[PDB]
Design a protein around this nucleic acid. Structure first.
Ligand SMILES: [Mg+2]
Ligand SMILES: [Mg+2]
Lengths: 226, 226, 224
DNA sequence: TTTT
DNA sequence: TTTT
DNA sequence: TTTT
């Protein structure tokens, strides 16, 4: 099976660990053994002019996933929304009410349907590829999330006297001479990881530590040596 | 305390990772320090003629657990159903509605009661040993589950041009010349493991990797060198 | 950020692994990098005369947290009750009705409000420090919990003809010549740990293993 | 309720 | 539904 | 709500 998935993750935090805005939207191609991705795309947001509430992310995600899918022709696209695996081209007012989600979730998706359903429909017509709202269940979506963490740190290195990056849940990053490696901290996930080439700037220091206000989320903090 | 527990686990998957049927039912004796089992029984199902909605699994589990219990005389039997630890001999329509479980769960157990309650009652009459529906809370149940994973792999090695075995949640297997070792991938469980003797066939290769459709579950795939 | 948090944890178990009563209430000061605590206080309960339904735990916790806070002057106090981070000084029946929790949870806290809310208000007046009900989301709270586990083992060392101590969730302890080290078993938490100096008595054996009745909780067993 |  |  |  060959899967394209997408996710948005990584946030700039203020000094009291409150998120300001999100950083990276990433689409990944994932193939057996489903532990990493070697082909991916990134779109960076502007975290300082981001509306955290909300849902530009999912629109950016589906667009980027389709863009990558047109190049690599996967079997399926996984979208990061836990709706039971329903095909997005089949999302209408009727099918959304039948969904086992909260009443806010239903109204959010009734609005999102207006743009996303025709998009998925046109893409399925062209290719036969479904876009499914699978979310938390998907390993490719979790690999996309790890890459969103990595690219958030890349963005921070490229855009830093100090920056706090809130990473996606329970993942770590490691800085190497010419690359950033991201890994899940959950061994139950079976060793999921990512790697992105980058040049690491001089004159800065970094540390990774637990976000004290959000258990199981880590903070990557960059500080200037000057 | 000395505990007998049982579980059914391991599934044949098709090439799109959809389960076809379950493989192994295992009963274990677990004693201090409650990390493994040295005395156990296995019953193999036929996964290609399995009713995944049938729920023959729990009938097989209680039967195999009672069979092992008659040999080793434990303090208690742990059954894999998370009902709050109620004794199975006490399961009637009255006690089932009082349980804090789903209405689907209540309707399943009202039907299961008709066979299982008399079975547990007669075993308690004979021995004084309770069969309790403890499920997810039980470490002996998790150890039975790990052994079901190991035995599913043994079954696959013995019955394979290629096979996909979906393992129980977050566990790995290791193949040695003369045995299979199974371990939980969750360090929070305190190091649960199992080991089964077997002959490993020639002319085949194997791989263990994440199920892309079911996060925190692994696939053990066997392929012929053919 | 500088944080005081508190928790009650660790339990005496009987021979069928049933809890009898809780042991340690611990207040910790937590600072960057938020992985441990070097400054903490402990209050021991009497586990053989403990009411597990009583919610004396949270009253002991807030008192000890305040006691430590007066000494180390933190930015905020984290209380181990998952109410979304609401300020305790702002807890009246109306705000409790609005909380996204169970109806039992609501009835418990309407009763707790009667004593704890005036305490938080007066403390906020004195220092400007909030006491927020953040609970499961707080790392300092988990560090307090790990320290409760450590102190429960210290209690066991101090009181052992044989004892079974049920530790807080997924943590381990190690006894060294002059200290007890506690660690989270969950690597997702990022390496949380604690350490307490104590004199280790002679003539004893100990073992750590899974509670067979409560998955992901360990038992510390000590014998003379 | 259980199963991957 | 999603975000730290 | 919390506890093993
Ligand atoms: Mg995500
Ligand atoms: Mg606690």
């Amino acid at each position: 099976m060959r899967i394209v998935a997408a996710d948005t993750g990584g946030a700039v935090l203020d000094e009291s660990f409150q998120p300001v805005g999100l950083i990276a939207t990433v689409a990944v191609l994932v193939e057996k053994p489903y532990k990493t991705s070697k082909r991916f795309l990134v779109k960076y947001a502007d975290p300082y002019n981001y509306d955290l509430s909300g849902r530009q992310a999912i629109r950016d995600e589906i667009e980027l996933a389709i863009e990558l899918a047109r190049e690599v022709s996967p079997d399926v696209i996984h979208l990061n929304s836990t709706l039971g695996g329903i095909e997005v081209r089949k999302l209408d007012e009727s099918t959304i009410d039948a969904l086992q989600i909260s009443d806010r979730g239903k109204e959010i998706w009734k609005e999102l349907s207006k743009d996303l359903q025709p998009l998925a429909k046109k893409f399925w017509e062209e290719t036969g590829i479904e876009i499914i709202a699978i979310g938390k269940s998907s390993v490719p979506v979790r690999i996309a999330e790890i890459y969103a963490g990595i690219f958030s740190v890349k963005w921070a290195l490229d855009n830093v006297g100090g920056l706090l990056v809130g990473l996606p849940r329970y993942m770590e990053v490691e800085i190497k001479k010419d690359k950033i490696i991201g890994k899940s901290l959950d061994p139950r996930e079976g060793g999921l990881y990512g790697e992105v080439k980058t040049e690491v700037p001089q004159g800065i220091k970094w540390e990774l530590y637990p976000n004290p206000l959000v258990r199981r989320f880590m903070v990557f903090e960059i500080t200037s040596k000057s």
